[PDB]
Design a protein around this ligand. Structure first.
Ligand SMILES: [Ca+2]
Ligand SMILES: [Ca+2]
Ligand SMILES: [Ca+2]
Lengths: 488, 488, 488
């Protein structure tokens, strides 16, 4: 049963057979098989084109992960929370971190669920932490210089150093047990409670018309105002948001009618359970059949139509019903499942590349997965800075990575422990590159901890340019370590 | 034939004979043979006198370079740009590129001629590219902050990355074929056409006393009211100033009289072609005879005398002729040669000393040759920035080295293919340093591409200081690679 | 008869015995035996605690070294020099350097005096040179931008480069001879004379109550005024300052009363010689029994109490004696020995750490010893720059390291050569790291030499941030070299 990275050590006429025979080149989840497409569908001379296509597909996957997280996931989370009298400023402080970190969390959950991929998770978390700490944070200060707040900055930097060293030592021990995962989650809860307490202490001291209007993702008057590049971005994003509108119900506590799109919501009482059934566990639970007569999706459709008609004729178009808030929960489920789905695909693609090019999980994680997971950070935070809120963006840039690392490691490892019934997740370090990654994260934190106070919390262009050059040097060292040029 | 360092070890009786008969020691560039003058003309006991005289001569050469750049070269470039209404980007990409890039092209042509030193020619071009994109560009932004033009900068940086990656791939294949050389030249012609077209679209959318006064480098009014130090500097500067006034014409647009000296310019109309001939290849075409009856220098003298008489009789003192600005072109040529000439002897001095102090060919190859080729870039660009044209100099730093790489590689390999009657040029990477140079060039281009837009094209001293630190780190990696601390 | 470094390969039940028997674990000075404490007086399970303790002890010693140097050594030096009426320009130039560099000088003296520790000296004198040039100098520009003076800067940078190249070539040759050490000291004298001449040419062109008060290290008004952190630092420094007030006399020419605390100084006529005889050579000369009846300390006490009684009964309260300045000499001498004593302990601790973890002398010297020796630099220079004198701080930052390296190497090696009656001091190589350190010092000097003129001597935040990032990269390369990731 040869390790199926040996596939390039074979004659091209045997490749497909190897892929079909070796269970090590089969995945546990997803819909497409990418090694099979590499070696069977495409002809051997057309290898580069295929891989080029794959990168494009991978990039498009990130786009989905961004949109779903920002327009459909966090709004419904906010609706659920604000149905329970929550505050305003910490809402902006922390929900920005949640929306920026959802892709990171779901990617870590997917990667930790398989020993062949767990390395990706670590590389993708630490890697993102480096990027956001240098390129995004520095970038903010180049776009608008501002004055940071001393106490929040020092609080965040301390908590994040603590989390980095906890993961550093868990990596040295080579494993992470149930108590460690529970400790990570508890430490995150402690951090949020501290934020709340300290803020308090600082302060004291026809219907078819609305179907069409509800399924239209364009605003033409705004669309003509934009530039050529933004128009191209919008036409790229059109199909994704059309599907998300079709399947995910959204509730805004802001708008007066709360997005009560009566007929679209009545249809989504049918559509959303189907996408949920066909998405959970890649649909394995879907073709499940009660008594060998009818599958799951049939009874789902029957009950869905019943409830959809019942609600359709029982409510008024201008007036939402009394159980309207429940839709947010539904919209929180289906959206999350969409994110999970896309995350699965991303991870599968990365695994495939590692087989074809014999690249480690750590390099793939800290480059491709990190950059893809941080695209949303860049959009959100640069846009927020250019609008006149660089202080909020800088706070998110250091308070969202804490969420990433703590919740990602804790929850991913906890779910793996529960599912596998084992007693720990094994973190085998992947050679010498993992220590380079950890050292780089520590050193970027040390640079910020010394520099920001010494400027008296007055951040400007020079700080950002220096952080950019730090990232360039870090990539130099990563490249050298991966080519075998530095060894021991 | 022994290595040229060993001449320090031989007996003093026949050191001069060894320097004479060994081809590997005698210089191939300039007008003076310094090794001969240090081992033959001077007694074996007066060597420190030779060393101190050589150092003083080197300092005087730097003075000559400074005066020529400040007084004769940059004024004529400005006159050309003003007369043709060229924008600073176009002026820095077309005219400044050729004058700055002549040494690079000629060195590449020579180096590609030998089948052994083909891959050593690629290293000089990459090294000079790294030096110019970091040190000269950063120095421009430190000495004089300015705002770059966004559209030309993006165009230039994109073309330069394309050319650099194309040379990466040609080096990786290990081969330059005739089709590749023609593709390089075609890409350069395409780039120049694009520059011109885009600029056009944007646009649419008695007499003896004056000979004696004109050839006079002294000003008595200033002379009387100076300090002793400045007086000594002026008297040290006089001979080169006089020769430069004699040989280089200067057109001035800021002057109402236009800086038109009728008899001096008419004489220059035969002096300047003569020096052009005598210092292109040190007069090889000058000594050659056409038809075996009238030699070349006689021909140029005859034609220049005829043209000078025509101009002298067609013009009055007070009003310059209608084609006055063309003198700037002549003044742009000769002065450029004065720079190239001088830079050569600077190099040919250091090399000489390197033999006496016993320095091997380890670092003198790929790093001394880039600095020697970039002396003119530094002088011209820094002078031009300090005079109020940092956009022109910055544009050269990213648009003239496109000329360097494309024309150097394409023309050198095309000439080799033609002469050798072969079909290919073998590029043989020698070790690990060529890939370090390639990676450094690519990474500095990436740094500038991210940084300049993120500053919104307003460049200041922080960007330049980061670029100097980058070059320091590049030298660190180069030294670690040369001593073998970085290996496989 | 193995080396002490083997102690950590024996069985845990024999370690202690080894340290008793092995002569190589015995230090030739000091008062405590740190190896005999880490193996014989502690349980093997709590070895980490001991090391943490040791580090804290180390840190406290550095505190001592600062206080004695700033508050007791330099004041008495000034009181001696004022007998020849020196002005305040010479003061701010050089006395700041003496007070800042005393710990460095005494550490080098202690380290050179033993072939087993002579590496620390080199590592510490170069390492501090790097740190003070990047972190302190850079920091001064971030806290307060200023315009540097050009002539002093060029003079200092030149002299420091010459000193660094001299030490680099002595390290390459592998030994320091008598004439080399005398050349170092003569070159320092030459530099100081040049500073004086250049500044000149520029200038042309009841009783019990006052015992209890004299021994009061607090000014409780200011203590009530200060913040929390300053209060904590003062309560940390209280015992050292109390002991220093008890033992070291002080003469202050600035005050009117001239620091003539009649009864305290008369009592210090007894206290001081006893401290001298007990800290000289760690007390070897103290027990030497003269004539088989009297130890040295006994006759010292008797003669001292005779002089003290005579002086007290022959002196006046508010009028100091005629020979008052003589006290200054005493106060200087005793204070020197305090520094010496503390320095010895530091060196011993570092040696022990090297034995335990098998760390080189160079790495311990360039990290721990250099940081501890530069703490006083940081305090003095940052405080001076925040009060509005950043030119003085910046000048001290480049003229104190010249004193430091020249006097340290010259005087430490000269004393060792005199004592051992040898002809030289060997500079044994600690492998590749020493060349990494020397190259880093040279490269930081080059960065400053190019950058500061290019800014036209107007120094700002960006320069300092780049120097900080340089130091981060340097410590990265050091850390890679120590673990053998880069080797040859
Ligand atoms: Ca993210
Ligand atoms: Ca050039
Ligand atoms: Ca010091």
């Amino acid at each position: 049963m040869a390790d199926c990275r040996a596939v390039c050590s074979l004659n091209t006429s045997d490749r497909c057979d190897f892929v079909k025979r070796n269970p090590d080149c089969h995945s546990e989840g997803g819909y497409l098989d990418y090694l099979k497409g590499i070696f069977c569908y495409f002809p051997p001379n057309l290898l580069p084109l295929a891989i080029t296509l794959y990168v494009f597909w991978l990039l498009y996957l990130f786009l989905i992960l961004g949109v779903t997280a920002a327009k459909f996931f966090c709004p419904n989370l906010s609706a659920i929370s604000t149905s329970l009298k929550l505050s305003h400023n910490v809402a902006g402080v922390t929900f920005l971190a949640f929306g920026n970190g959802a892709p990171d969390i779901f990617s870590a959950l997917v990667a930790f669920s398989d020993p062949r991929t767990a390395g990706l998770a670590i590389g993708a978390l630490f890697g993102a932490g480096v990027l956001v700490t240098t390129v995004v944070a520095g970038g903010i200060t180049i776009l608008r210089p501002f004055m940071a707040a001393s106490r929040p900055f020092l609080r965040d930097i301390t908590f994040y150093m603590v989390a980095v060293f906890l993961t550093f030592t868990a990596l040295y021990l080579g494993r992470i047990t149930l108590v460690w995962a529970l400790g990570y989650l508890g430490l995150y809860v402690f951090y949020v409670v501290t934020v709340i307490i300290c803020t308090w202490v600082y302060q004291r001291q026809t219907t078819g018309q609305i179907l069409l209007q509800a399924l239209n993702p364009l605003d033409y008057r705004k669309w003509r105002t934009q530039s050529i590049s933004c128009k191209l971005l919008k036409v790229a994003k059109l199909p994704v948001e059309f599907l998300l509108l079709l399947t995910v119900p959204v509730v805004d506590p802001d708008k007066d009618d709360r997005n009560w799109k009566r007929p679209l919501n009545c249809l989504q009482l049918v559509i959303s359970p189907l996408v949920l059934v066909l998405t959970l566990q890649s649909g394995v639970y879907g073709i499940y059949e009660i008594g060998g007569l009818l599958p799951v999706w049939a009874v789902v459709v029957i009950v869905g139509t019943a409830l959809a008609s019942v609600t359709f004729f029982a409510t008024s178009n201008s007036e939402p019903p009394r159980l309207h808030w429940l839709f947010a929960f539904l919209g929180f489920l289906t959206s999350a499942l969409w994110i999970n789905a896309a995350a699965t695909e991303v991870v599968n693609i990365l695994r495939s590349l590692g087989v074809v090019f014999r690249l480690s999980n750590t390099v793939l994680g800290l480059t491709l997965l990190a950059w893809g997971n941080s695209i949303g950070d860049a959009f959100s935070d640069f846009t927020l800075a250019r609008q006149g809120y660089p202080r909020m963006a800088f706070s998110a840039c250091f308070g969202g990575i804490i969420f990433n690392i703590l919740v990602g490691v804790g929850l991913g490892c906890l779910l793996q422990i529960v599912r596998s019934h084992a007693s720990e997740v094994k973190l085998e370090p992947d050679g010498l590159l993992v220590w380079v990654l950890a050292s780089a994260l520590g050193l970027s934190l040390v640079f910020s901890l010394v520099s920001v106070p010494l400027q008296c919390f007055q951040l400007s262009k020079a700080y950002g340019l220096c952080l950019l050059l730090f990232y360039i040097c870090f990539i130099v060292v990563v490249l050298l370590t991966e080519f075998g040029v530095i060894h021991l």
